[PDB]
Amino acid sequence: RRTPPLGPMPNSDIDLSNLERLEKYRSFDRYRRRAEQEAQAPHWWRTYREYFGRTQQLLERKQAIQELRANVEEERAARLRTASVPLDAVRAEWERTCGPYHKQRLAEYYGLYRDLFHGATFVPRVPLHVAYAVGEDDLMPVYCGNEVTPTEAAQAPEVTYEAELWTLLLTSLDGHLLEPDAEYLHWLLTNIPGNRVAEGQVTCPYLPPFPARGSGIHRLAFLLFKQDQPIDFSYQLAQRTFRTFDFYKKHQETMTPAGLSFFQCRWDDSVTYIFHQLLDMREPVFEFVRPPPYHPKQKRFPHRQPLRYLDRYRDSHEPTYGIY
Amino acid sequence: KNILVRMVSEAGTGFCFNTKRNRLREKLTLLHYDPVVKQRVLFVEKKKIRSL
Amino acid sequence: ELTFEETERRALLLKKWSLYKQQERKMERDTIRA
Amino acid sequence: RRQGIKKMEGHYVHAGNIIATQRHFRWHPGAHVGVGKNKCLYALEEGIVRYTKEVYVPHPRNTEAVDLITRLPKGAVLYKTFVHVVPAKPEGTFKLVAML
Amino acid sequence: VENEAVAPEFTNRNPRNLELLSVARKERGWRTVFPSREFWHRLRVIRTQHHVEALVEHQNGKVVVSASTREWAIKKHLYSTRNVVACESIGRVLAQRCLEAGINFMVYQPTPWEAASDSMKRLQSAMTEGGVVLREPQRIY
RNA sequence: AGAGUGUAGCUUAAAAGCACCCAACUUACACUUAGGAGAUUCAAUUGACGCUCUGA
RNA sequence: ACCUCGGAGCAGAACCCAACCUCCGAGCAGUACAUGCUAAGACUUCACCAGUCAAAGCGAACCUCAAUUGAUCCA
Ligand SMILES: Nc1nc2c(ncn2[C@@H]2O[C@H](COP(=O)(O)OP(=O)(O)OP(=O)(O)O)[C@@H](O)[C@H]2O)c(=O)[nH]1
Numbered sequence: 110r111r112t113p114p115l116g117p118m119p120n121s122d123i124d125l126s127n128l129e130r131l132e133k134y135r136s137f138d139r140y141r142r143r144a145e146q147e148a149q150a151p152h153w154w155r156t157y158r159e160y161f162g163r164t165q166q167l168l169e170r171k172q173a174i175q176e177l178r179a180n181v182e183e184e185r186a187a188r189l190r191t192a193s194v195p196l197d198a199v200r201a202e203w204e205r206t207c208g209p210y211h212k213q214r215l216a217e218y219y220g221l222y223r224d225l226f227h228g229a230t231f232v233p234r235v236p237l238h239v240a241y242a243v244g245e246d247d248l249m250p251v252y253c254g255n256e257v258t259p260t261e262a263a264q265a266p267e268v269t270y271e272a273e274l275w276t277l278l279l280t281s282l283d284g285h286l287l288e289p290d291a292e293y294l295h296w297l298l299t300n301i302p303g304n305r306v307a308e309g310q311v312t313c314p315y316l317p318p319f320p321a322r323g324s325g326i327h328r329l330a331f332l333l334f335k336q337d338q339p340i341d342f343s344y345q346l347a348q349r350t351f352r353t354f355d356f357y358k359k360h361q362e363t364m365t366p367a368g369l370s371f372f373q374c375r376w377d378d379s380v381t382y383i384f385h386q387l388l389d390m391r392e393p394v395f396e397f398v399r400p401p402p403y404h405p406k407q408k409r410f411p412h413r414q415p416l417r418y419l420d421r422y423r424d425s426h427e428p429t430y431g432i433y
Numbered sequence: 434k435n436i437l438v439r440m441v442s443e444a445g446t447g448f449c450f451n452t453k454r455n456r457l458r459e460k461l462t463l464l465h466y467d468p469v470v471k472q473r474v475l476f477v478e479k480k481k482i483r484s485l
Numbered sequence: 486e487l488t489f490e491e492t493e494r495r496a497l498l499l500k501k502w503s504l505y506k507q508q509e510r511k512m513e514r515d516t517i518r519a
Numbered sequence: 520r521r522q523g524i525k526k527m528e529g530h531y532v533h534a535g536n537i538i539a540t541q542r543h544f545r546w547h548p549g550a551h552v553g554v555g556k557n558k559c560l561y562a563l564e565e566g567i568v569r570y571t572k573e574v575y576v577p578h579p580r581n582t583e584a585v586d587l588i589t590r591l592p593k594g595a596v597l598y599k600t601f602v603h604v605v606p607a608k609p610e611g612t613f614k615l616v617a618m619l
Numbered sequence: 620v621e622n623e624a625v626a627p628e629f630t631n632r633n634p635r636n637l638e639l640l641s642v643a644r645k646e647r648g649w650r651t652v653f654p655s656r657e658f659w660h661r662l663r664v665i666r667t668q669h670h671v672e673a674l675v676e677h678q679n680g681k682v683v684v685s686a687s688t689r690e691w692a693i694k695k696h697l698y699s700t701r702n703v704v705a706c707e708s709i710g711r712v713l714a715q716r717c718l719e720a721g722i723n724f725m726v727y728q729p730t731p732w733e734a735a736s737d738s739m740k741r742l743q744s745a746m747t748e749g750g751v752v753l754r755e756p757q758r759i760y
Numbered sequence: 761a762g763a764g765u766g767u768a769g770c771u772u773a774a775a776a777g778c779a780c781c782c783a784a785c786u787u788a789c790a791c792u793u794a795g796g797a798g799a800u801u802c803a804a805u806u807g808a809c810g811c812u813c814u815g816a
Numbered sequence: 817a818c819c820u821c822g823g824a825g826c827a828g829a830a831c832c833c834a835a836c837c838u839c840c841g842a843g844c845a846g847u848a849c850a851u852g853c854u855a856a857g858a859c860u861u862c863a864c865c866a867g868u869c870a871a872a873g874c875g876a877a878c879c880u881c882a883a884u885u886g887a888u889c890c891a
């Protein structure tokens with residue numbers, strides 16, 4: 110018996126008797142591209158994915174490109190493969206043009222939306238900038254998905270963003286110790302006048318990151334919301350715990366997210382200090398424990414098995430003597 | 434045909450291993466891992482074990 | 486051995502021939518289709 | 520020879536179990552499925568076995584497959600049957616060991 | 620002490636937690652097919668007729684960090700977007716973006732001719748000098 | 761005079777992907793690597809600058 | 817002539833099964849000298865014997881394909 114296909118069988122549309130007259134895959138790369146396209150395309154059969162799933166600006170760009178091409182030095186450098194690019198200028202231009210979209214993809218990849226807004230997304234329009242002052246001569250930035258140690262995050266960071274009120278908020282998406290879903294707030298400035306941040310209302314004082322030892326890597330998120338009109342709101346974990354989902358549900362009418370910046374924090378002696386000095390509690394230490402190795406049910410007669418069979422099931426390695 | 438020969442460690446240990454070489458080919462000298470010394474060392478053909 | 490200026494001139498020659506023979510093939514194909 | 524499939528789809532499989540024994544490549548290794556010297560398909564993880572059809576992209580070093588695929592019409596794409604192990608348990612969990 | 624109330628089992632929801640700890644799984648199969656899926660992050664380069672593009676993509680298929688010369692911010696600084704200079708510049712930009720995104724380790728899966736390509740060599744040199752290492756650490760079992 | 765109207769050769773692409781060409785490897789082709797050129801006809805969805813068809 | 821082993825007729829599609837018969841082949845060769853040591857879990861010619869694959873780990877680098885074979889005792 111033969112059940113007919115439930116859809117267009119692959120390679121069926123092009124199945125023709127003019128194979129000789131049909132152009133072929135002269136190269137491996139073109140076939141690779143076609144195969145990737147097919148894999149991306151949905152199918153009616155079981156697949157691996159099922160189981161493991163302005164005009165003036167254009168004119169200006171054209172004119173600038175024409176000028177760059179006309180510049181002979183640029184052409185000479187390109188043909189001599191010695192030219193370079195201004196990384197800082199490229200970074201700034203990308204931030205202005207399409208940085209929000211890439212930051213959105215990073216947030217989706219890190220799961221902030223699924224964990225903060227239960228899947229609801231947005232775009233960080235405002236090119237926010239956060240930096241934790243390390244020492245006095247420098248300040249480590251906090252990009253989207255950066256990596257900063259709690260020692261560097263000990264003190265509150267400097268925030269800069271060219272805009273005009275604002276509410277800034279810091280959460281530890283996975284720093285909670287009792288309830289998996291909840292998270293701890295570290296500092297929250299509200300009703301920020303324009304750019305200056307010292308004038309913000311400190312609803313909750315500043316806490317440094319405190320990721321427990323051997324607890325993995327914790328993602329900390331700076332959220333920034335545009336604020337239409339001010340609203341009155343409201344070292345203890347019970348009060349630092351909350352959910353950004355319902356928190357922002359309570360204020361979405363006048364608050365709208367427009368900035369994001371998140372980083373990764375590990376354990377540190379500053380975490381020890383945070384747990385002891387001010388949290389006033391014994392710090393928890395977590396260890397990654399793998400499940401015990403699987404062994405089949407022990408047989409009375411382990412036929413053809415090596416002598417190690419019995420050791421696989423013995424628990425104590427020291428000699429035992431029973432009644433004697 | 435080929436012959437089975439006993440390559441013996443040149444590191445002074447009694448370690449040996451059997452290899453195959455053409456009878457007409459010259460005697461064999463070969464780098465091989467020596468478990469006793471825990472290091473790759475030279476081995477030299479000592480005697481023909483058998484003919485195969 | 487060679488200098489930098491002759492290399493630049495050679496590259497410009499390759500560019501200009503690319504343009505010229507691109508136009509040649511385009512006009513040949515246009516005549517074909519016509 | 521007693522070859523063929525040893526674990527059909529939906530069967531729970533422990534790491535190391537042989538999924539299918541074959542002479543030729545009837546079924547190809549998927550995700551978390553390793554291939555022995557004799558083309559035996561074994562589970563590299565503990566989970567459920569799933570059979571799917573996937574586009575076949577041979578390794579460039581495979582001269583015969585590359586020649587076959589370059590001799591192919593511009594629209595055609597090869598498909599092969601693949602075996603995957605959908606891991607069940609997580610790699611592990613973080614447990615409180617001491618309240619220092 | 621109420622503050623000491625800690626659940627016996629921690630729950631780190633960061634997608635990159637185990638991946639960064641070097642304990643997460645990698646798809647170790649697919650031995651008969653190319654490219655290998657045994658990675659956490661992959662550097663994929665697409666050299667079109669006009670544009671050269673690079674992606675840092677997770678095993679699940681999510682694109683994590685993309686650098687395309689199609690973008691104005693990058694194409695407004697080089698003569699040709701389909702040459703060795705374009706490849707090197709886009710590689711440097713991708714290295715900077717990967718560092719700012721926290722992606723330090725990567726897997727590159729070029730074809731023999733792609734690897735032999737001088738532009739690919741320049742792109743790999745740019746990435747490694749930018750900091751991204753094109754060789755992921757081994758899993759810890 | 762009327763109709764269809766309109767992105768470089770093609771695109772139920774939105775300034776992109778395929779196309780296309782030479783330089784080297786090929787007797788040669790092909791592959792690959794290096795490079796190359798390219799368009800949304802002009803004014804405010806609308807009218808008129810260019811093409812195809814229907815007539816004299 | 818044959819007695820062991822591999823492949824086809826040959827199970828139309830999991831496995832195994834057509835003996836007798838028609839046949840076609842093997843009793844190796846080539847490479848390498850980590851072709852080292854260990855070890856979860858599995859397959860298995862319908863018994864046993866025997867024969868297969870193998871994660872992880874140590875130590876290193878950064879097998880091949882049809883069969884190609886033989887137990888105990890004893891030297
Ligand atoms: N393993 C092994 N044992 C052998 C071999 N040849 C002989 N034997 C031993 O000796 C027995 C056969 O004896 P014989 O037939 O007399 O052997 P032979 O080598 O022809 O003659 P003798 O040396 O006079 O015994 C075997 O059953 C074994 O015990 C051999 O090639 N291998």
Ligand SMILES: [Mg+2]
Pocket residue numbers: 860
């Ligand atoms: Mg059996």
